[PDB]
C-alpha cells in the first residue's frame, strides 16, 4: 500500500530524470548551478530541474537532504521539521515550515509530505510528494509539493564527488505575483545548493 505509493512516486521521478533536453528551458545558470523548467503536468505551473556538483559522497549528501534534524539545521529556508509517521523501506510522513520570503510577500508556508529514500543506479534518490492532512495551522499557508526529489550519483571523473539533480514542483498556493513566484523558486534552488555545500 505505502510500498505501492512509494514505488509509483519513485517511478515518476525516474521518468522526470529521463525527460530529454529539448523539453527543458534554461531558467538560471550560475557558476556552479544550472536550473531548467518546463510546464508541469500536475498543475498550472512549473516543474523545475536543478543540477550541480557536490564535493562529497552520495550517502553523506542524502543524509543531509532527507527529512530530519540535519536538513532542518543547514537549510536556511526551513524553520521547522517534524516526522509525523515512519514506515518500512525508508519511508516517512513529515511536516515542515518555511521562512517568509521576499519581505513576506510570501508568508511562511507549511508542507506535509511523504518521503522515500531508495537506491538509484550507483547512488540514491530521495523523493517526496504532499499528502492530504487535516490539522490546519492558521499561521502557515499550506503549500503543496507535487512529485519532487533529489537524485545523487557519483561523478564521472571523480567518484568522491557527486552530481546532485533536483526536481522541484512546488505550488506555494495563496496569491503571489508570478514574478515573485519565479524569484522565490530561483532563490530557493540557489540557496539550497549554497547552504548544502556550506554544511558539508
UniProtKB/Swiss-Prot annotation:
GO MF: cholesterol binding; cholesterol transfer activity
Claim: Transcription is one of the keywords in the record: no
Stored SMART domains: START (SM00234)
Domain START per the UniProt entry, residue ranges: 1-200
InterPro entries to which the protein is assigned, alphabetical: StarD4 (IPR042555), START-like_dom_sf (IPR023393), START_lipid-bd_dom (IPR002913)
Pfam families membership: START (PF01852)
Gene3D superfamilies: 3.30.530.20
UniProt source species: Homo sapiens
Catalytic activity of the protein: cholesterol(in) = cholesterol(out)
GO CC terms in record: cytoplasm; cytoplasmic vesicle; cytosol; endoplasmic reticulum
Keyword vocabulary terms for this entry: Lipid transport, Lipid-binding, Transport
Record's function text: Involved in the intracellular transport of cholesterol. Binds cholesterol or other sterols.
Gene name of the encoded protein: STARD4
Source species taxonomy: Eukaryota, Metazoa, Chordata, Craniata, Vertebrata
SUPFAM superfamilies: Bet v1-like
GO biological process: cholesterol import; cholesterol transport involved in cholesterol storage; intracellular cholesterol transport; positive regulation of bile acid biosynthetic process; positive regulation of cholesterol metabolic process
The protein's name in its UniProt record: StAR-related lipid transfer protein 4
Domain of life: Eukaryota
